[PDB]
Design a protein around this ligand. Structure first.
Ligand code: MET
Length: 517
């Protein structure tokens, strides 16, 4: 089914300035979106801000300014950050948007009509910071900003409070069987696998109904009213999760502003999401609540939720990008960490990867095959006959796109990078064995073959690395003189797509500059 590939980030609470957490989540969303655009697919990537709720309102009250002013300002800080980071997100959604609120009301009303929302009570624990209902098994003893004894969440460590409110309740308990059927029929719907298993174990244990409204005083009147009941506000999470639906329904102009909300999601061919990128801290809301709501409303379910290893709720990414380069930092963040906190994020390791992989492996190779000493005609040469060693390298280059494609689709961007760099290491080894610098004087016919394979390997690896290194990839292709048309599209994943006789671009000038150890 040819639709628009729909990839999302979470929408971030505006209680606080943007930091690495949000940058990382949105980076992953951006990389996926970029890969599918490189593949030649229609893409709509979404990110944004989560602006209502008790947590934000109390942050605004702490800074002594109105919630409207506060949210608008911080939303601006997030936008500025994502421009600075040079993402290619198609739209930035804010839950304060009137068209978003409209959608929330439509969805709420649908749930109510299907009989899945009733008036009840929630009596139990709540983490305002996580906007999360917790059971007594999920709390323990801790301390508040003072240092007084209190209760805190086991999930997150933030303070919990007991809540006793008459609330509108969603009949989540009724969706346990269908959610379990969903997880089992779609065993790749949650990545990584151990997080999928975690969700299943949880839903197996049983599901309580879920409070989807709060008394308006509690949220300092900073939330969406419940349709037909002004005394209640819609739970920030139902509000927040609904952004995905809203985004799927907005026509957006070339400038990036929302201009229209379509009635039927199918008009824009985005819903449901093909990939929801989230942090591990909000898995339950996306893998349990969200699909339960969609099941109630008869809406289609997302294909994949990928939950990465860091919590999204001192290390300044803009500052490090100014120091080491933007693409470099992006490469590091995506290469250093798989689905764990077990990444080494120090300057030592940043420089180690910068010098070792980016400069020594990739950059060095680019200069070798474009060098005036080795590539004396400044062109793609026409290869002669291939040796078995030539063919071994060629096979790797041919196999690479299929391998990288699967990884990007899991999605597992770390493994995609590793796969490309395995081939880059192999090309370097080949170049070292063939010693093309010596062949310029000794065997020009042989050099043609060696140089051509090298150039082609570099092009193909660069193409598959272009979602990770969007700017540097362009520089590389410019050096190789690859025409624009060949920088995109699955047809150009194939070996030999750039014909011999193509001229290299002019030289000026380093690709990645190494740094003091
Ligand atoms: C619908 S995604 C909501 C995410 C939440 N606002 C957070 O920052 O953790």
């Amino acid at each position: 089914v040819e639709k628009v590939f729909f990839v999302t980030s979470p929408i971030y609470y505006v209680n606080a300035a943007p930091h690495i957490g949000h940058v990382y989540s949105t980076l992953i969303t951006d990389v996926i979106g970029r890969y599918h655009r490189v593949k030649g697919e229609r893409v709509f990537a979404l990110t944004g801000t989560d602006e209502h709720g008790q947590k934000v309102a109390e942050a605004a009250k702490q800074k002594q300014v109105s919630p409207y002013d506060f949210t608008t300002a911080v939303a601006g800080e997030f936008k500025k950050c994502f421009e600075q980071m040079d993402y290619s997100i198609d739209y930035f959604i804010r839950t304060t948007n009137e068209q978003h609120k409209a959608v929330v009301k439509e969805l709420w009303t649908k749930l109510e009509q299907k009989g899945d929302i009733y008036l009840g009570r929630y009596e139990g624990w709540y983490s305002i910071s996580d906007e999360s209902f917790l059971t007594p098994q999920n709390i323990t003893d801790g301390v508040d900003k003072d240092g007084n004894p209190c209760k805190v969440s086991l999930e997150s460590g933030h303070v919990v409070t007991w809540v006793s409110e008459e609330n509108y309740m969603f009949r989540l308990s009724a969706f346990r069987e269908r959610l379990l059927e969903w997880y089992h029929a779609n065993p790749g719907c949650i990545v990584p696998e151990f997080r999928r298993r975690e969700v299943i174990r949880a839903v197996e244990k049983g599901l309580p109904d879920l409070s989807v409204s709060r008394a308006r005083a509690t949220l300092h009147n900073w939330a969406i009213p419940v349709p037909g009941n002004p005394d209640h506000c819609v739970y920030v999470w139902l509000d927040a999760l609904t952004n995905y639906l809203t985004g799927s329904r907005l026509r957006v102009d070339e400038s990036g502003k929302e201009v229209s909300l379509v009635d039927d999601f199918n008009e824009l061919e985005r819903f449901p999401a093909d990939v929801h990128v989230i942090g591990k801290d909000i898995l339950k809301f996306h893998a349990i609540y969200w699909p339960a709501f969609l099941l109630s409303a008869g809406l289609p379910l997302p294909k994949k939720i990928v939950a990465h290893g860091w919590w999204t709720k001192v290390f300044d990414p803009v500052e490090k990008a100014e120091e080491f380069g933007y693409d470099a930092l992006k490469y590091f963040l995506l290469r250093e960490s798989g689905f764990s906190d077990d990444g080494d994020y120090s300057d030592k390791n940043m420089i180690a990867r910068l010098n070792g992989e980016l400069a020594d492996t990739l950059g060095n190779l680019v200069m070798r095959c474009t060098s005036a000493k080795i590539n004396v005609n400044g062109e793609w040469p026409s290869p002669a006959a291939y040796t078995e060693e030539d063919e071994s390298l060629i096979q790797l280059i041919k196999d690479l796109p299929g391998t990288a494609d699967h990884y990007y689709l899991i999605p597992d961007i770390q493994k995609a990078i590793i796969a490309v760099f395995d081939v880059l290491r192999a090309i370097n080894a080949y170049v070292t064995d063939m010693a093309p610098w010596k062949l310029v004087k000794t065997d020009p016919e042989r050099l043609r073959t060696v140089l051509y394979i090298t150039l082609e390997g570099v092009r193909v690896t660069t193409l598959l690395l272009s979602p990770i290194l969007p700017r540097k990839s362009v520089v590389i292709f410019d050096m190789l003189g690859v025409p624009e048309v060949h920088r995109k599209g699955i047809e150009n994943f194939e070996f030999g797509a750039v014909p011999p006789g193509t001229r290299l671009g002019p030289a000026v000038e380093v690709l990645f500059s190494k740094r003091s150890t």
